[PDB]
Ligand binder design. Structure first.
Ligand code: HEC
Ligand code: HEC
Ligand SMILES: [Zn+2]
Ligand SMILES: [Zn+2]
Lengths: 136, 136
């Protein structure tokens, strides 16, 4: 019933990135530069295959600094983690949702079984609750 | 004496990212969101090792659209490529420098055998001509 810390996620496939700056509706709490990562099982789902149990997607969120017409990555703020288990995470559409403050395994963030996470992700039912699209 | 197109670079290790906005000294031609990738051999150099022959670093540059204070990745503009071969690329400090327009193997951008690239990268002699640092 708990999402595993995704050890070694930084070596996985980089799906995409986006910057959320002040003024964006989502500045609280996903303000910053984020990078999405996918393990091999998640790549199968992202390609248009189905997501096997053990698929993991990571939302890696950094603070940034303005440095002379550059946004430079600062400290990690958190990671979001989606872990596929159709049975064990059936209450949240077959994905377990967890956050780790500063990406630390000991700073688990989710208190409601991931219902809040699932609430936003539910809009994406038709793409198996995943916003991110594989790009070249 | 030509740099090979780095086929499969998008499945490599994501080292780091940075946004270069309009007004930056380098806006022509590296304005946009860039992602740095390293093959296995390049990781050895980034971790504190000697860069072995066969090390490849890729600078993957995307256009972006500012959309309600989100910076959203658009089309790939180009990739920059550094390929380690101490003998073959001896004239430019053991790295071969090349650009591919839109990341296409047919669109070679370097016209001076990489002397201009080398000219900037030479400032980083003490880190084997590599600007990017491995981060967690
Ligand atoms: C809407 C108000 C959101 C809430 C609440 C949560 N997330 Fe989210 N998430 C959202 C968007 C619009 C995106 C796509 C970002 C992009 O660059 O395209 C995401 C992405 C993720 C990812 C990457 C996988 C994907 O679906 O694209 C993960 C792993 C993720 N989110 C986890 C997550 C968790 C654990 C949440 C509860 C703490 C959570 N999200 C809330 C929008 C929203
Ligand atoms: C200074 C005026 C530059 C010139 C001319 C070129 N590059 Fe560059 N490059 C520069 C900086 C400051 C950085 C680091 C970017 C970051 O996010 O920190 C880079 C990076 C690269 C990379 C990634 C590897 C690394 O050294 O960090 C590659 C593969 C790369 N650059 C290639 C490249 C080529 C092929 C050039 C000539 C066409 C070239 N660069 C010119 C600064 C400068
Ligand atoms: Zn200025
Ligand atoms: Zn703005």
């Amino acid at each position: 019933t708990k999402v595993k810390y995704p050890d070694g996620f930084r070596s996985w496939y980089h799906v995409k990135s986006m910057v959320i700056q002040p003024g964006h509706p989502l500045e609280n709490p996903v303000g910053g530069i984020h990078h999405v990562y996918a393990n091999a099982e998640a790549i199968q789902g992202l390609r248009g295959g189905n997501y096997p149990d053990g698929a993991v997607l990571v939302f890696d969120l950094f603070d940034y600094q303005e440095d002379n017409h550059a946004l430079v990555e600062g400290k990690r703020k958190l990671i979001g983690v989606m872990e596929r288990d159709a049975k064990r995470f059936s209450a949240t559409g077959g994905w377990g949702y967890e956050g780790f403050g500063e990406g630390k395994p000991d700073k688990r963030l989710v208190t409601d079984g991931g219902q809040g996470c699932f609430g936003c992700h539910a809009a994406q039912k038709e793409s198996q609750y995943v916003f991110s699209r594989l790009r070249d």
